[PDB]
Amino acid sequence: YKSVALVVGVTGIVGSSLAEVLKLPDTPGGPWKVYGVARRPCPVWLAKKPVEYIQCDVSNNQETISKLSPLKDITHIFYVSWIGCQTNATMFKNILNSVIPNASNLQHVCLQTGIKHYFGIFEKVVPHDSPFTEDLPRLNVPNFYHDLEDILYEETGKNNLTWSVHRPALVFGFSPCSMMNIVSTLCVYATICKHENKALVYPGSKNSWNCYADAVDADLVAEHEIWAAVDPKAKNQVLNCNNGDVFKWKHIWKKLAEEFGIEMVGYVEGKEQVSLAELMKDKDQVWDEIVKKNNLVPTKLKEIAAFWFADIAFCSENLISSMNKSKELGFLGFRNSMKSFVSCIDKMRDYRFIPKAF
Amino acid sequence: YKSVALVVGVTGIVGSSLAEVLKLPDTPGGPWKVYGVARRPCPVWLAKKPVEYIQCDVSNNQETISKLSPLKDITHIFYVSWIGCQTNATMFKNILNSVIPNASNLQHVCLQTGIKHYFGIFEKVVPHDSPFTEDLPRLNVPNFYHDLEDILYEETGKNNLTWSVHRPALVFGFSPCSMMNIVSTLCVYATICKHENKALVYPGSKNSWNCYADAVDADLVAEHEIWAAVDPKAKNQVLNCNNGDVFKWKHIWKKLAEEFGIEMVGYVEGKEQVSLAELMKDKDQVWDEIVKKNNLVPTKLKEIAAFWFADIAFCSENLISSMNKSKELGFLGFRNSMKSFVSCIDKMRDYRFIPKAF
């Protein structure tokens, strides 16, 4: 092995893409050894992969020391755990305190944050307008992402390590474990509609129907993090990560209806946004019956879908981010966002989480 | 010489970029010989370049035959003349009728149209929504661009030639001859404001201030046309061409003010769009005095600026085009649109068409 990755959050959407992409033939930095850390016991999908799984609650300092301090060969840390204050800072500090003193060939720390935390719902002071670039200064408004950056900079600086900060847009992806996942949430809603013989009714705002939006494929995020981990010209940079294009929810919606073979009802002029979370609140038993009727992987509705997260997406606009910095540094990776969305639907079907198309 | 280009419209914004780019070291298809056709006598900027200049009114059939039929060595036609009905069709037909029977090693015809003709101001039948892709079918609405495509397909088909249709977004560029040029128009307005000690007052709509827009650098259009002219995998395709990013007029405006060292007045809530053409209607003499006072290249206001064209830009929105098709075919060329806009300002200054910054 040439390089040794510690993927913190391996069962998450991006973490699961890193485990796969790190193991492909001709991956930069390779051949890679991969340690994958997550709180749950190793999922069956990941047990069959060449990943060394470490079950660890990284919010527990002792346990993090016990399980990560023996891993002497780590060269690259990829901190990609979903970010839901002091707990996120503590988790990241735990990782760095447990590995930095023990891994004598440690080179680089990759920190994943996001363009916006929950679409900016928590952000008095006038915010920066879009298209979002990485050179925009920090505004005097508290931010959990800025607290993690500060720990990265301090710990990498003192220890002669390189750093990256990756700011993914809304992620399109799927793996057998990760929730707070937009495509899964929308596929679940489509599946319920189809089961109940109802149309795929758009519950969102006018503006989110018609505005330009962007996103990022989980695999592209993995490629971008690996690139910044191995390209010396890319190191010690804050870097956005999106698919390189724009889309509209209205087009995703039509595609979604088409893929499920159901009628669409788009935005209806004058009709106000309604909560998808509200529409779905009494559907937990319906979901149980769908799983049974279609022999799906048993999931609970609250585990596979986050309707509240779709609701925020559908009252958001003006959130486009730029890839000019990455491109000007030589990263020309992209995805067709419409093709990426469909590929996630296909993947959920292939893994039996939602019914087949026919 | 390996390849022999006939650049129809060499004094235009894209044509002048093709003449330059076709002559760079290590240009695909090279070394290129370049014939440049335009109606005016050879400009002094272009006389010093290794371009064989052909003065020709291509709307005159006889003259086109007289001047183009002796050019036996042409391999590639680049039809990039500005498109202002029967006249545009006739001009293109003239070119093909004059060259196809005479140029026995002719390979390829590149046809440049646009994403929209004059931002769609001439387009009953419900138009296609954006982001614009090349697979969207033709709608039963007359279109001068569709008439030129039809001639391309018919003439290339019958003669065993390959074709390309390039659909540039709004072009950012500058050369010493071309009008209907957005950056020039805005630099001229900025120059007048500065001369008169007034602020750079935005005269446009609210929506065009705040909406996402896109554009294309003239040099990137040249690179894209050359790529499709030489890459066999790219041939016989309709292909959009933009810089790969998005911007907003509000940000361009601030940049424009900054570059001229003048105060900005942005969009003012409640104030309706006013015509820039109207604001400038009695400025022809003012422009003469600015040229004199700053020793600029002598231009007439009506030749260097098209304020009406800026006015259309500033009541337009929802015109974003996709580069996914080109990227998926392996064309990864891009520009930072904000940097491209500034480079055009720099170029106009360098060539002495507008005053220096200080």
From Swiss-Prot, chains A, B:
Give me the residues that bind substrate, please: 116, 145, 316
Q: Where does NADP(+) bind?
A: 11-13, 39-40, 57-58, 81-82, 112, 145, 171, 178-180
Q: EC class of this enzyme?
A: oxidoreductase
Instruction: Kindly state which reaction or reactions the protein catalyses.
Output: (S)-8-oxocitronellyl enol + NADP(+) = (6E)-8-oxogeranial + NADPH + H(+); (S)-8-oxocitronellyl enol + NAD(+) = (6E)-8-oxogeranial + NADH + H(+)
Q: Which UniProt keywords apply?
A: Cytoplasm, NAD, NADP, Oxidoreductase
As for subcellular location, the record says: Cytoplasm, Cytosol
What does the entry state regarding organ or tissue expression?
A: Expressed in internal phloem-associated parenchyma (IPAP) cells.
Superkingdom of the organism of origin: Eukaryota
The primary site where this protein sits is cytoplasm
Q: What is the effect of changing residue 119 to M?
A: Slightly reduces enzymatic activity
- One Pfam entry for this protein is PRISE
Active site, per annotation: 116, 145
The biological process GO terms on file are: monoterpenoid biosynthetic process
Which EC number(s) does UniProt give?
A: 1.3.1.122
Q: Name one GO molecular function term.
A: oxidoreductase activity, acting on the CH-CH group of donors, NAD or NADP as acceptor
Q: Which InterPro entries does UniProt cross-reference here?
A: NAD(P)-bd_dom_sf (IPR036291), PRISE-like_Rossmann-fold (IPR055222)
* Gene Ontology CC entries for this record: cytosol
Q: How does it assemble?
A: Homodimer.
Write out the similarity annotation: Belongs to the short-chain dehydrogenases/reductases (SDR) family. Highly divergent.
| Function comment | Iridoid synthase that catalyzes the first step in generation of the iridoid ring scaffold using the linear monoterpene (6E)-8-oxogeranial as substrate. Iridoids comprise a large family of distinctive bicyclic monoterpenes that possess a wide range of pharmacological activities, including anticancer, anti-inflammatory, antifungal and antibacterial activities.
Q: What is this protein called?
A: (S)-8-oxocitronellyl enol synthase
Lineage, top ranks: Eukaryota, Viridiplantae, Streptophyta, Embryophyta, Tracheophyta
